[PDB]
Amino acid sequence: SSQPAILIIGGAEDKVHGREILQTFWSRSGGNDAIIGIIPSASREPLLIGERYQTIFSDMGVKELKVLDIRDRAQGDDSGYRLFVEQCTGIFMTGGDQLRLCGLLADTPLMDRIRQRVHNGEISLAGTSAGAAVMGHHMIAGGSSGEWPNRALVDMAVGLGIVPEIVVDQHFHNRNRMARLLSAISTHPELLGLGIDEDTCAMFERDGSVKVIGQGTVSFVDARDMSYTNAALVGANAPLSLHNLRLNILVHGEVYHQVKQRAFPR
Amino acid sequence: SQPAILIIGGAEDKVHGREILQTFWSRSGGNDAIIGIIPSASREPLLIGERYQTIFSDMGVKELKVLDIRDRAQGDDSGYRLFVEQCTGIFMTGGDQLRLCGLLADTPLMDRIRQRVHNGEISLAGTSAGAAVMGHHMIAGGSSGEWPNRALVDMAVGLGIVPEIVVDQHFHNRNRMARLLSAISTHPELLGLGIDEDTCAMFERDGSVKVIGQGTVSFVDARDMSYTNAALVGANAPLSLHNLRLNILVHGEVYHQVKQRAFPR
Numbered sequence A: 001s002s003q004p005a006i007l008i009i010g011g012a013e014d015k016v017h018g019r020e021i022l023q024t025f026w027s028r029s030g031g032n033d034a035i036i037g038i039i040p041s042a043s044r045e046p047l048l049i050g051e052r053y054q055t056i057f058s059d060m061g062v063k064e065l066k067v068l069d070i071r072d073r074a075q076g077d078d079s080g081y082r083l084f085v086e087q088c089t090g091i092f093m094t095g096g097d098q099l100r101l102c103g104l105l106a107d108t109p110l111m112d113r114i115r116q117r118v119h120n121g122e123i124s125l126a127g128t129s130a131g132a133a134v135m136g137h138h139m140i141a142g143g144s145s146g147e148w149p150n151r152a153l154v155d156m157a158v159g160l161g162i163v164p165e166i167v168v169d170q171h172f173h174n175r176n177r178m179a180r181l182l183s184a185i186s187t188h189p190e191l192l193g194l195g196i197d198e199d200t201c202a203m204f205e206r207d208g209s210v211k212v213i214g215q216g217t218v219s220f221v222d223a224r225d226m227s228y229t230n231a232a233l234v235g236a237n238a239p240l241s242l243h244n245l246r247l248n249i250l251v252h253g254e255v256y257h258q259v260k261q262r263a264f265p266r
Numbered sequence B: 001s002q003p004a005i006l007i008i009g010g011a012e013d014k015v016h017g018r019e020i021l022q023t024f025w026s027r028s029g030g031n032d033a034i035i036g037i038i039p040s041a042s043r044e045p046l047l048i049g050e051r052y053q054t055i056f057s058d059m060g061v062k063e064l065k066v067l068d069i070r071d072r073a074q075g076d077d078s079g080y081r082l083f084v085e086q087c088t089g090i091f092m093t094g095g096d097q098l099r100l101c102g103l104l105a106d107t108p109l110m111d112r113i114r115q116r117v118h119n120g121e122i123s124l125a126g127t128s129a130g131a132a133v134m135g136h137h138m139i140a141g142g143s144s145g146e147w148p149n150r151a152l153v154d155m156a157v158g159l160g161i162v163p164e165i166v167v168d169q170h171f172h173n174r175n176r177m178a179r180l181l182s183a184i185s186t187h188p189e190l191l192g193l194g195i196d197e198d199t200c201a202m203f204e205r206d207g208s209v210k211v212i213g214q215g216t217v218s219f220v221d222a223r224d225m226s227y228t229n230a231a232l233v234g235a236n237a238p239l240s241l242h243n244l245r246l247n248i249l250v251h252g253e254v255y256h257q258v259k260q261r262a263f264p265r
Helices: A020-028 A046-060 A073-077 A079-087 A098-105 A109-119 A178-187 B019-027 B045-059 B072-076 B078-086 B097-104 B108-118 B177-186
Strands: A006-009 A035-039 A064-067 A090-093 A124-128 A138-143 A154-158 A166-170 A192-196 A200-204 A209-214 A218-222 A242-250 A255-257 A262-264 B005-008 B034-038 B063-066 B089-092 B123-127 B137-142 B153-157 B165-169 B191-195 B199-203 B208-213 B217-221 B241-249 B254-256 B261-263
Touching (some): A006 A020, A006 A192, A020 A090, A020 A124, A035 A046, A046 A064, A064 A079, A073 A079, A073 A098, A079 A109, A098 A138, A098 A154, A138 A178, A166 A178, A178 A192, A178 A218, A209 A218, A242 A255, A242 A262, A242 B261, B005 B191, B019 B089, B019 B123, B019 B208, B072 B097, B108 B123, B137 B165, B177 B217, B177 B241, B241 B254
Parallel strands (some): A006 A124, B034 B089, B089 B123
Antiparallel strands (some): A006 A200, A192 A218, A209 A255, B005 B199, B137 B153, B199 B208, B208 B254, B217 B241
């Protein structure tokens, strides 16, 4: 209930009503004792988006907030920001563009330390929209809908590697992103795909479980027992086949257990 | 050239190789084919009928008839029913699937088409609306851009040609996976087949399903589903579906219905 976790949020989360997802991040960051850094670097309006979340978390009641306004990679070396990261209890990555966020943050001392403290179980990390997309080592940077799966449908890139064993997609059902996720999985079938809807969150707990929170669904797309794909045989614009996939679509309160590779009801 | 049932995802190629339509032609007897075209799904039946008349005539057939049923009474018409006894294949055009069922379902004419198809005497193809009618349970409409929920899909009664399946069409092109998942949640005993434009799932008499054409067929299987919240939640609430099996197939690949397994070309 206040144990550190990683919250992967599908974008457009509730900022007005119960704010259940944002409240959960707040609680897992220490609640009234939270020291939270907001990274708005995905956005081309960082002050506005940074102020928005600032106001949300300050209204919830925290010990301290800081907007880590990294607009160039050199600020990833900044002593002041790096010191705050040592003191913090939670980090929140806003939406924007995931390629931009990784360009500014990936492999910086600041982000290396955030990732280390997350992996060590010292702090919580949340990311929404672009901030969700960057969670994997392999990242869906873009891509379209309205087509059958094909490798050209999805733009792959390198993320922050917070959760290396997964590939995240976001605004998922809302933007009909299943085909692009399937396209990503065809050539990374060792990775669990997570398609996370708007105002929905996959919360990765320290024990390996993933709890779903919020308004929609999380789709777990598992090609680890795939019996065949034509991916290596066909051109990038040709349709993909994927045989023997396992699909789990979860809603609020349900859990996917990563070690068991199975889902369970509320 | 053994009779088969071709379930076509719409917008099939009518101009180039016409691979799907040529397959129907072949399975209907080729140069000896006697093909009826049912344009009843459409509000322009004469024009769509003529389109397919031209295509199949160009391929070379023995005889064509447009079974222009525009009211349920014509389902009793002896001339059309006589043709159905003589034919070797029937093609159901696109349009609106509710309209097609409203006109054809449980008529003497359609009951005999269904029986001759079941008996292995004639081939059947349907595209777009004509594909949607193939199951007993039919997807009559619905939207995209939402998580699966029962209100996302409009279910109705189809023609029951292949009762153990539920078909969706123009599938990936119109992002219809969520509505198909929504349908399967209501009927998880049914194998869902999501068929892309210019793609076909061809049901063979041996129980296999061969995929033909440009895109994919998605076989969405909830028969081993471990849990769903479907019985507990309202129609507009998000649905969970645990332990689904998904097979996405392309041209030349085969799904075996009995063993529930797909195979490459």
